[PDB]
Amino acid sequence: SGFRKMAFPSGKVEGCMVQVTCGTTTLNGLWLDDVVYCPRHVICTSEDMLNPNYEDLLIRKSNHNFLVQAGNVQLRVIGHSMQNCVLKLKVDTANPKTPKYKFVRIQPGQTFSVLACYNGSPSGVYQCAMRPNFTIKGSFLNGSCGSVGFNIDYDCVSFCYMHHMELPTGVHAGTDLEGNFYGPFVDRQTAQAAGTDTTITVNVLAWLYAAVINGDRWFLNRFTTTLNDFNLVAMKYNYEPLTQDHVDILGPLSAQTGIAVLDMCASLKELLQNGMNGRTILGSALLEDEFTPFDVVRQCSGVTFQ
Amino acid sequence: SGFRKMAFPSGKVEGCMVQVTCGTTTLNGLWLDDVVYCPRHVICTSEDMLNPNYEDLLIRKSNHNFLVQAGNVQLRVIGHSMQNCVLKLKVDTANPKTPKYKFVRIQPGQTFSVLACYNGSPSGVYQCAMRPNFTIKGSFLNGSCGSVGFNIDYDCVSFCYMHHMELPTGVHAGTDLEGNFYGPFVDRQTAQAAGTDTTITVNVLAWLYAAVINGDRWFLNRFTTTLNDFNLVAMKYNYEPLTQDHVDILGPLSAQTGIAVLDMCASLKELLQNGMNGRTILGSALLEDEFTPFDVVRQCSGVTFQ
Ligand SMILES: *[C@@](O)(c1nc2cc(I)ccc2s1)[C@@H](C[C@H]1CCNC1=O)NC(=O)[C@@H]1[C@@H]2[C@H](CN1C(=O)[C@@H](NC(=O)C(F)(F)F)C(C)(C)C)C2(C)C
Ligand SMILES: *[C@@](O)(c1nc2cc(I)ccc2s1)[C@@H](C[C@H]1CCNC1=O)NC(=O)[C@@H]1[C@@H]2[C@H](CN1C(=O)[C@@H](NC(=O)C(F)(F)F)C(C)(C)C)C2(C)C
Numbered sequence: 109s110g111f112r113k114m115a116f117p118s119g120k121v122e123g124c125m126v127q128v129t130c131g132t133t134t135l136n137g138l139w140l141d142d143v144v145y146c147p148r149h150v151i152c153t154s155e156d157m158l159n160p161n162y163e164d165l166l167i168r169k170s171n172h173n174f175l176v177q178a179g180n181v182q183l184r185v186i187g188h189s190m191q192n193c194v195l196k197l198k199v200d201t202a203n204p205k206t207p208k209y210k211f212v213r214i215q216p217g218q219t220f221s222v223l224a225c226y227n228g229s230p231s232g233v234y235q236c237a238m239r240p241n242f243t244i245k246g247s248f249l250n251g252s253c254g255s256v257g258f259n260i261d262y263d264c265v266s267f268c269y270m271h272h273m274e275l276p277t278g279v280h281a282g283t284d285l286e287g288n289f290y291g292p293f294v295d296r297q298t299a300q301a302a303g304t305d306t307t308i309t310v311n312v313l314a315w316l317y318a319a320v321i322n323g324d325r326w327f328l329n330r331f332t333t334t335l336n337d338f339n340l341v342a343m344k345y346n347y348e349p350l351t352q353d354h355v356d357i358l359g360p361l362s363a364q365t366g367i368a369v370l371d372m373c374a375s376l377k378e379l380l381q382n383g384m385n386g387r388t389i390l391g392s393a394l395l396e397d398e399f400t401p402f403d404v405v406r407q408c409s410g411v412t413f414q
Numbered sequence: 415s416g417f418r419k420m421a422f423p424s425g426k427v428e429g430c431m432v433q434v435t436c437g438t439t440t441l442n443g444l445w446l447d448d449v450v451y452c453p454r455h456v457i458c459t460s461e462d463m464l465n466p467n468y469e470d471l472l473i474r475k476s477n478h479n480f481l482v483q484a485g486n487v488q489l490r491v492i493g494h495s496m497q498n499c500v501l502k503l504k505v506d507t508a509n510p511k512t513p514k515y516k517f518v519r520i521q522p523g524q525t526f527s528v529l530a531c532y533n534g535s536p537s538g539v540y541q542c543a544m545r546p547n548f549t550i551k552g553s554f555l556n557g558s559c560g561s562v563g564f565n566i567d568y569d570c571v572s573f574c575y576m577h578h579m580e581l582p583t584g585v586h587a588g589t590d591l592e593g594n595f596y597g598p599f600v601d602r603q604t605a606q607a608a609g610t611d612t613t614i615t616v617n618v619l620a621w622l623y624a625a626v627i628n629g630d631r632w633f634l635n636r637f638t639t640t641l642n643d644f645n646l647v648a649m650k651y652n653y654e655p656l657t658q659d660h661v662d663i664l665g666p667l668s669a670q671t672g673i674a675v676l677d678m679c680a681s682l683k684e685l686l687q688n689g690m691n692g693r694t695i696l697g698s699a700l701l702e703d704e705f706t707p708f709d710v711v712r713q714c715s716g717v718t719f720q
Contacts, residue, residue, distance in 0.1 A: 110553040110584050114538035117529065119425030223423065229718035232420035233539060245697070247416040249716040278416050278628060322584060391551070393699035410555040412535035 123205030127228025136254030194287025242291025246280035429511030433534025442560030500593025548597025552586035
């Protein structure tokens with residue numbers, strides 16, 4: 109049936125994207141009900157970004173200083189406040205296209221769809237994981253800030269990411285929708301790098317199950333292993349420890365394919381120690397770690413409106 | 415800045431998806447203005463699909479036999495006709511969410527976004543290429559039929575694919591929106607396989623340019639080559655011939671990076687002959703051929719509403 113990096117359909121979020129301009133600085137914002145959420149550094153010029161005092165820049169602004177555009181309709185701002193690294197702009201019109209929604213803070217290892225936007229207008233959608241080092245491997249240019257990441261579950265959009273910045277090796281950092289950074293990063297143009305990343309073990313195992321489901325089974329061996337013994341090995345290759353919680357979350361896939369989790373662990377142990385020997389799994393030459401157990405079930409069970 | 419398999423934002427097409435039921439068979443349809451387009455085999459039961467006579471099945475149907483649902487609103491059908499492998503259902507309500515749109519027949523090598531749908535409801539979006547053998551490497555389950563592929567250009571959705579069937583090695587076949595199959599495939603459950611596939615040379619070159627743009631340049635050599643000499647080599651590794659038209663289409667990327675097309679050809683020739691030596695290009699261990707020159711520019715230049 110096939111297996112692809114699938115993004116959540118983006119319509120629900122496209123209806124919420126707007127452009128926010130303060131002075132000559134413009135970026136994206138998220139219009140939910142009568143509030144627009146955008147990165148606080150919309151209030152910054154070039155100069156300001158080496159070392160901004162945001163409380164200071166902001167006190168010098170007033171409501172009318174923020175130009176909010178939904179398409180070519182302007183929205184009138186009637187209040188503003190800063191929450192962490194995010195600015196909230198109260199507008200006098202509720203977004204009629206607001207979907208049912210929640211703000212969530214995802215954990216390292218969870219995947220989400222990014223709607224990359226420029227000028228309040230949607231460029232594309234793609235799927236990402238929050239890496240263990242709290243970066244995302246994105247695709248973002250100048251003007252993408254305020255682009256958002258999200259999950260859908262039936263009718264409900266859980267927004268979990270807002271884009272702020274690009275770190276030295278071409279990866280990305282940002283906040284939840286309460287303006288709290290993932291990872292130890294700050295919103296200033298100063299030198300910062302991600303710590304060392306690690307592979308999301310549980311996701312690799314999920315992807316292996318997806319391969320069994322798709323009939324790609326060559327890598328299955330005859331062995332089992334213990335959780336402890338598996339994890340000593342994983343450690344060497346810079347894989348996350350697999351926890352009981354991760355084992356439990358793989359339970360659906362385990363039960364569908366009839367392969368015990370620790371049996372799949374034994375197969376992965378071998379792949380880490382022997383390599384793939386120029387073979388692919390699901391068309392791919394490396395082990396993939398940006399599919400969660402839920403992503404595999406969704407794609408393999410056909411879960412819709414999400 | 416990063417480089418991902420980016421899909422077109424799907425909102426414009428999500429607003430057009432509906433469920434079509436005839437008897438006990440249900441699949442997806444596309445509601446544009448006052449017409450619903452769906453695969454003609456909505457008129458088939460299990461039995462019928464070994465060897466269907468579609469003109470015969472259809473003459474026995476009337477308008478009221480087709481249950482069209484947009485969400486939980488039913489649409490009243492007032493006419494029907496078959497065009498090739500597609501059924502057109504005239505309904506008495508125009509879809510107010512119809513975007514500006516065109517039907518196009520893409521060429522082998524062009525990419526598009528698939529909105530995978532079940533029960534007239536959107537499951538996910540992903541990017542695909544029309545392979546030289548006229549299949550797509552999709553991700554599709556039972557009930558996905560009538561899912562559509564499309565490009566966006568500013569406000570305009572060009573629909574180029576409608577999903578019909580899955581071929582032996584887990585790849586996919588379907589029609590344009592006039593119901594004409596890509597490739598020599600037919601809509602019956604009979605034995606059919608894709609011919610041998612080939613790599614889309616021009617797309618590989620475009621992706622290499624994307625890598626140079628992203629600062630991944632290790633694979634650039636000091637050489638040039640002729641088009642003829644390049645193509646003799648490509649042939650051995652089962653790459654499409656590169657034409658002057660393909661050279662011309664790579665002109666923007668060539669000019670932006672300052673690397674002549676035939677110089678990039680020389681670098682690819684080496685990669686085909688030497689392999690990648692356990693190195694990656696843009697995180698990937700294999701050469702990727704499902705990005706067009708336009709896809710690279712769009713993603714690298716930040717082109718929106720598309
Ligand atoms: C973004 O879109 C924003 N652009 C601007 C421009 C102005 I004038 C004011 C505020 C903002 S937010 C986004 C840009 C793109 C840039 C390339 N890839 C992205 O993801 N954000 C930034 O430019 C942020 C912003 C400044 C500096 N910055 C960075 O991403 C920079 N990174 C860093 O300095 C480091 F910490 F290493 F990550 C840089 C531009 C990539 C060098 C803020 C406030 C951090
Ligand atoms: C699709 O969603 C449809 N399902 C039905 C069910 C009925 I009853 C009537 C009409 C349709 S269209 C889609 C299904 C999924 C199936 C798994 N992956 C897909 O892409 N289409 C089909 O089931 C089509 C349909 C029958 C047989 N068929 C196939 O895809 C089959 N392939 C072939 O026989 C072969 F030619 F090799 F490709 C099969 C189900 C994968 C074995 C039509 C009319 C071709």
